[PDB]
Amino acid sequence: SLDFDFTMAFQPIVNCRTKEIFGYEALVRGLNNESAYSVISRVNEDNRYLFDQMCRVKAIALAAKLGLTSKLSINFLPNAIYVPERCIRTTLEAAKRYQFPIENIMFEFTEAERVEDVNHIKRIVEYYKSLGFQTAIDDFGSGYSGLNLLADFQTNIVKVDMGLIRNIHADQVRQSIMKNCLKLFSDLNIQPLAEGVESHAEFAWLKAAGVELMQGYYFAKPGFESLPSVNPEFSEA
């Protein structure tokens, strides 16, 4: 073990077709709502497995304490940790003590590590899918999270990076990128999710294009140790 402490904020993912909440992403904060980066910047190589586990337990315990009945999304620590089976029971144990279905837990793989050689996140994704977890590719269209991931394995969901979503209602290039990626997603039976939606104009274009799942300040900012309600402008039109 116990070097430093932190907690979670939660940000809803909204199904714009049914206007209900698909789930919440768990986002780490310091005890006074300090930033995620200011917490993760204290995570080094020696306490990576401890911090990984504590994030998982902390997100599961808080979501359950707050009464989350939809999905809980947890970023998988990008550091390609090994023996994917080692300390997966620490996540299985936590979900059992809070009676939280494995099937309601989605791990988001945000590949952005030091070495561009680690395709064996495929081993981890296929293992986690075998236990019943949902899976997502995070930050698709940025960093390392690219087509190279889709080529070798497919997750339930792909979170399109907010760089690709910003101002898309009037950016012809991003429009074409998204149009052709959605058909790719459809061909791969993968569900899209647009992240970082900030304005109604982006929302309205994404929804016409066929995206149902969306996340962003437009719907709700992350809520410190709380499960935010979603913007009235969208939930009543």
55 contributes a contact to ligand 4BW by CB under 6 A: yes
13 contributes a contact to ligand 4BW by CB under 6 A: no
CA 118 – CA 175 distance, rounded (Å): 31
Q: Which of the ranges 28-36, 79-87, 90-98, 124-132 carries the binding residues for ligand 4BW, by CB under 6 A?
A: 28-36
Which of positions 156-215 make contact with Ca ion (CB under 5 A)?
195
Closer CB to ligand 4BW, residue 56 or residue 182?
Answer: 56
Q: Which 3-state string (H, E, C) describes 155-194?
A: CCEEEECHHHHCCHHHCHHHHHHHHHHHHHHHHCCCEEEE
Interface pick for Ca ion out of 16, 76, 100, 108 (rule CB under 5 A): 108
Query: To 10 degrees, what angle do helices 200-209 and 172-187 make?
Result: 40
Q: In the complex, what is the shortest distance from the CB of residue 92 to ligand 4BW, in angstroms, rounded to a whole number?
A: 17
Which of positions 203-222 make contact with ligand 4BW (CB under 6 A)?
216-217, 222
Of 149, 154, 153, 202, nearest to 178 (Cα)? 202
Closer CB to Ca ion, residue 75 or residue 135?
Answer: 75
Assess contact for 6 and 30: CB atoms under 8 A: yes
Q: Which of the ranges 50-58, 102-110, 160-168, 222-230 carries the binding residues for its own copies, by CB under 8 A?
A: 160-168
CA 86 – CA 6 distance, rounded (Å): 23
Interface pick for ligand 4BW out of 15, 30, 36, 171 (rule CB under 6 A): 36
16 carries a ligand binding annotation: no
Assess contact for 208 and 220: CB atoms under 8 A: no
Closer CB to ligand 4BW, residue 151 or residue 189?
Answer: 151
Q: Residue 221's Cα: distance from chain center in Å?
A: 14
CA 223 – CA 229 distance, rounded (Å): 9
2 contributes a contact to its own copies by CB under 8 A: no
Assess contact for 102 and 92: CB atoms under 8 A: yes
Q: Which of the ranges 14-22, 85-93, 161-169, 224-232 carries the binding residues for its own copies, by CB under 8 A?
A: 161-169
Q: Quote the Cα angle for 67-71-72, to 5°.
A: 80
The helix (H) or strand (E) run that includes residue 204 is helix 200-209
144 contributes a contact to its own copies by CB under 8 A: yes
Residues forming contacts to Ca ion in the complex (CB under 5 A) are 75, 108, 138-139, 195
Residues forming contacts to its own copies in the complex (CB under 8 A) are 115-116, 140-148, 150-152, 154, 161, 163-164, 171, 173-174, 176-177, 179-181, 183-184, 187-188
Annotated binding site for Ca(2+): 25, 75, 108, 110, 138-139, 142, 144, 195
Annotated binding site for 3',3'-cGAMP: 8, 11, 28-29, 55, 198, 217
